[PDB]
Design a protein around this ligand. Structure first.
Ligand SMILES: O=C(O)c1cc(C(=O)O)c2c(n1)C(=O)C(=O)c1cc(C(=O)O)[nH]c1-2
Ligand SMILES: [La+3]
Ligand code: NA
Length: 563
């Protein structure tokens, strides 16, 4: 959408979930910098009036602040002059049908803006367009069916004249899709499934490519169903509950697909394509430009849905248009975002042990049999797999600084025992089939050696041109918030104890901290109002001893330098 694109070029706004379409969560604002961020203070606060996890972050457009909540997903438009609500919208949702099928708290990743409207993807899968000035509903469409186990937790994305939204339900046998709705009417324009025949997936057998035998090659016929046994793909997962990015020059939307449904791999032989994959789709038609499967035949629920950040960077002496993705499976991937060529794939937490490496010719991770839950078998405990199913990074999106050339990862440092067992599908019921327990990785993030630690989180700086950790800071709990990098040389993020922290973008040294009321699982965003830069974050623990550090919450804290 060229209007949204124009809005994102004004640093005073934060007009999409990721600040810009490329998803780098980097702000050119530099009023707050390494010299003065120690002088930051809370400026004002706002309770959302709702409890449970507060993911996502504020969306600021032309001085109006828009904030969202977990179920029932009330939306507020806030006037920064009076710090009062301009309008609010609370959808009517059936709690008894929607809550039981939410796998991982009642969270909502946030809003989109476009064509004078705010777009809210509701938990019950109703996608609703609101007038941005009045908050009155313009249109809405039921994007899924919670009676089949479908929910929505992710943020929509405005792209050209469409609103892009996905689906959740990889633990309920939902077949994942990405859908595009007309921005003005809500009519469905295209729908791209993650698996099934080409008319469903919008894969072109001679034009859609993948990485194979060391080169970009057409995907061929029956690329998906030939990797599934029989009809298992009809309930086969690959859901789409992560973040979406967009390259306007290429007109490509990028995203990841989740786990292949049941957590018992022996029950579903085959690569299970295209679960656990990265995708580039034509924004106008949905046609897949390229797809890359990171985790064939998943055995651990390492959902491939984490964001795909788009950056131009030098690799082997040449400027490349890349896509960078820090997967649940603990590998940080760099691809050519035009062709889908695989460039870099290295572990961003050296505790990771389920695979030795990613084979660069075949593109497939080489599974280490001791940590294979299928190898050890049904009803046998696989012990000490790293990472835990919740991954080395979960939903919390990364930031990128062009000043340093580093990505900043809000990381998990958690391993697990995992025991699969055979399960049967019933629509509306869970379709899992594994028993897990988790514990601290207990190994150094950089060397991989046992270290006597018990930290559950890492905050890690990563060079995606070589695939190397630059520095990493231990955090006592997993880091579940989306960071922010700025032209002031600082990186912001939130902790589960509720601290908003600022660190030096180059070195990782801490420069500021403040205890907000509840653990932060949202995104730290920044904007400018009447010439002053503000930094905003939601607090409210949820998603996924911590309970002695934080209780449930739901507040916004806005920080600024004092006057
Ligand atoms: O397979 C799915 O469809 C689906 C959805 C979600 C979701 O919608 O929040 C999560 C997961 N899977 C998942 O595996 C996971 O670890 C997870 C963590 C969280 C969270 O917000 O903290 N959501 C989800
Ligand atoms: La999942
Ligand atoms: Na195909």
């Amino acid at each position: 959408n060229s209007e949204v694109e124009k809005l994102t070029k004004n640093p005073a706004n934060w007009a999409t979930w990721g600040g810009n379409y490329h998803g780098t969560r980097y702000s050119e604002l530099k009023q707050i910098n390494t010299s003065n961020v120690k002088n930051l203070q809370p400026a004002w606060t706002f309770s959302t009036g709702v409890l449970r996890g507060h993911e996502g972050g504020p969306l600021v457009v032309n001085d109006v602040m828009y904030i969202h909540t977990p179920f029932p997903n009330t939306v507020y438009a806030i006037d920064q002059k009076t710090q009062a609500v301009i309008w609010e919208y609370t959808p009517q949702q059936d709690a008894d049908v929607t809550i039981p099928v939410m796998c991982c708290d009642t969270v909502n990743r946030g809003l989109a803006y476009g064509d004078g409207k705010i777009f809210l993807q509701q938990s019950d899968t109703v996608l609703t367009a609101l007038d941005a000035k009045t908050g009155k509903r313009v249109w809405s469409v039921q994007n899924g069916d919670p009676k089949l186990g479908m929910t929505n937790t992710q943020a929509p994305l405005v792209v050209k004249d469409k609103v892009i939204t996905g689906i959740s339900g990889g633990e309920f046998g939902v077949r994942g899709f990405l859908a595009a709705y007309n921005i003005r009417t809500g009519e469905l324009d295209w729908k791209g499934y993650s698996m099934g025949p080409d008319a469903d997936t919008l894969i072109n057998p001679t034009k859609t490519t993948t990485w194979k035998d060391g080169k970009v090659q057409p995907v061929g016929k029956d690329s998906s169903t030939s990797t599934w046994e029989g009809d298992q793909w009809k309930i086969g997962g690959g859901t789409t509950w992560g973040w979406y990015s967009y390259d306007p020059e290429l007109n490509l939307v990028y995203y990841g697909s989740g786990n292949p449904s049941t957590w018992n791999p022996a029950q579903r032989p085959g690569d299970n394509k295209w679960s656990m994959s990265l995708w580039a789709r034509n924004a106008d038609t949905g046609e897949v430009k390229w797809v890359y499967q990171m985790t064939p035949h998943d055995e651990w629920d390492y959902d491939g849905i984490n964001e795909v950040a788009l950056v131009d960077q030098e690799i082997k002496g040449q400027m490349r248009k890349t896509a960078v993705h820090f997967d649940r499976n603990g590998f940080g991937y760099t691809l050519d975002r035009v062709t889908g060529e695989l460039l870099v794939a290295e572990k961003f937490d050296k505790a990771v042990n389920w695979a030795s490496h990613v084979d660069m010719k075949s593109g497939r991770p080489q599974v280490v049999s001791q940590y294979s839950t299928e190898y050890n078998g049904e009803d046998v405990n696989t012990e000490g797999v790293c990472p835990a199913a919740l991954g080395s990074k979960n939903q919390q999106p990364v930031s990128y600084s062009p000043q340093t050339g580093y990505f900043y990862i809000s990381g998990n440092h958690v391993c697990m025992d995992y025991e699969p067992f055979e399960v049967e599908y019933t629509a509306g019921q869970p379709y899992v089939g594994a028993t897990l327990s988790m514990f601290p990785a207990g190994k150094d993030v950089i060397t991989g050696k046992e270290d006597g630690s018990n930290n559950l989180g890492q905050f890690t700086a990563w060079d995606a041109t070589t695939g190397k950790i630059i520095w990493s800071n231990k955090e006592q709990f997993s880091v579940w918030s989306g960071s922010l990098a700025t032209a002031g040389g600082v990186v912001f993020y939130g902790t589960l104890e509720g601290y908003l922290k600022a660190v030096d973008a180059k070195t990782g040294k801490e420069l500021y901290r403040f205890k907000t009321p509840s653990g932060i699982i949202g995104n730290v965003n920044t904007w400018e109002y009447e010439g002053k830069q503000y930094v905003g974050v939601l607090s409210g623990v949820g998603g996924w001893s911590l309970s002695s550090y934080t209780k449930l919450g739901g507040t916004l804290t806005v920080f600024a330098l004092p006057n």
